[PDB]
């Protein structure tokens, strides 16, 4: 029975009507984990942030209407957490866990609009002891990882190529360029500029290269993001 993983920034879930329409998107999906980011709930507001099926909903929120993560599990998946590591400021969730019984680490990260490839590098740097042959990093990166995720096809600047080289020397891939070495599919669209790019992200261990089926994205009515699904095997 094969797993499936689900990231998507939702933009925002402190109205109702919100809510109601991601739980009928996420039970639509079925995916048996789901990360979520810019959920804007604050660390008051975390209990809003509830829908049938995934009762298991991790999160790290900061004080204000501002980022905010999440990873929901299926009530169908047999999860048995094993550590979950918040950010004090939202903008990250670590949650490691088995799944019959085979271990897997997820990151969930929203890097924010400035700076985002260098904060996540500092990311992977101070979450360095719990990177293992069975992570899953995912989430709203802010920035493109090559040329190809870009119309404008340029090329990724100095920060980028440290943070893919940081990726490089923990043994992390990006899946879904691997998966489709070609793909021009963008995941977000700035309207200011008429630029298109993937912004959102699967990157993983190498040695979960083999269990990755497919890998797909998920246009929608919810947010101003495009959503990533993967299968594992
Ligand atoms: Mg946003």
Same mark, same amino acid.
């Given at each position: 029975s094969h797993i499936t993983i689900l990231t998507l920034n939702? *933009?925002? %879930? *402190?109205?109702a009507i919100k809510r109601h329409r991601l739980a009928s998107w996420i039970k639509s999906q079925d995916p048996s984990v789901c990360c979520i980011q810019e !959920?804007? %709930?604050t660390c008051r507001d975390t209990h809003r942030l509830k829908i049938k099926g995934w009762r298991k909903i991790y999160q790290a929120n900061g004080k204000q209407k501002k980022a905010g993560v999440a990873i929901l599990v299926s009530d169908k998946t047999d999860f048995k957490p094993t550590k979950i590591k918040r950010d004090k400021e939202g903008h990250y969730i670590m949650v490691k866990g088995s799944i019959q019984q085979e271990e897997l680490t997820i990151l969930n990260i929203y890097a924010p609009n400035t700076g985002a490839p260098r904060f996540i590098k500092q990311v992977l740097s101070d979450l360095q002891r719990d990177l293992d042959s069975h992570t899953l990093i995912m989430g709203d990166? *802010?920035?493109? %990882?090559? !040329?190809?995720?870009?119309? !404008?096809r340029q090329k990724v600047n100095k920060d980028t190529q440290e943070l893919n080289s940081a990726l490089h020397q923990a043994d992390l891939i990006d899946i879904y360029r691997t998966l489709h070495p070609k793909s021009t599919e963008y995941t977000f669209f700035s309207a200011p500029h008429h630029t298109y790019s993937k912004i959102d992200h699967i990157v993983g261990s190498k040695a979960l290269l083999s269990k990755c089926k497919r890998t797909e994205i998920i246009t929608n009515y919810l947010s101003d993001h495009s959503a990533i699904k993967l299968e594992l095997r």
């Open positions: 939702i *933009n925002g %879930l *402190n109205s !959920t804007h %709930l990166f *802010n920035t493109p %990882l090559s !040329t190809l995720d870009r119309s !404008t």
